[PDB]
Amino acid sequence: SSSVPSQKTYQGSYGFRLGFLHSGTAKSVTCTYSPALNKLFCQLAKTCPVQLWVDSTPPPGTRVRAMAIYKQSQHMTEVVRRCPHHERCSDSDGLAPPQHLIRVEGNLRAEYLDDRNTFRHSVVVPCEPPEVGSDCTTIHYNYMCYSSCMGGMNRRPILTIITLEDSSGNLLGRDSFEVRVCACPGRDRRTEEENLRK
Ligand SMILES: Nc1n[nH]c(C(F)(F)F)c1Br
Ligand SMILES: [Zn+2]
């Protein structure tokens, strides 16, 4: 029942693309990224660092938006939202609406949008230059339901679409990755990578 945002990779004029830390697959890992699967595996509500890389610095007022969509064709028109349990668990920080799957952690300038026409959720933050001893800016995301949550994602895979935007919201660049929110990301990444090898 909602229009489907593009997931097509688009570096644009600034050469925009994502990067991910190399956190490994130990049983204790809270978030780990598989380049072979283009897939982030993370625990519920834990910090997911996502790097922003550009070839040239975009203008002041540039922002970065995150939105989830279902990966599969039969589900892509459905808004990705938190499940009936988690939307009612009183865990909002006062900024993120309790229905939103994706939050930004530790940024008081995060804004949360309920799109008036598509009803899709997204979270957008201003782009700032890298910290003093760093080559890239990093955003910390949290995912607020498990992939398995009944009445929400319900075991359906999702993509996160990251869009670099100007101050009006016009597209400057786009990238994306699949997400699985699960209890043991390290084990699940190993299993899915071993499966891909077979
Ligand atoms: N000075 C900068 N380096 N990288 C960025 C990014 F966030 F837009 F990617 C800026 Br703004
Ligand atoms: Zn849930």
Swiss-Prot record:
Q: Which residues carry this modification: Phosphothreonine?
A: 191
What is the recorded phenotype of mutating residue 103 to S? In a sporadic cancer; somatic mutation
What result is annotated for mutating residue 182 to W? In sporadic cancers; somatic mutation
Result when mutating residue 106 to V = In sporadic cancers; somatic mutation
Mutating residue 97 to L: what's the consequence? Answer: In sporadic cancers; somatic mutation
Tell me where it mainly resides.
Answer: cytoplasm
Effect noted on mutating residue 193 to V: In sporadic cancers; somatic mutation
- Protein name per its UniProtKB record: Cellular tumor antigen p53
- Please state the gene responsible for encoding this protein: TP53
Q: Which residues of the full protein are shown?
A: 94 to 291 of 393
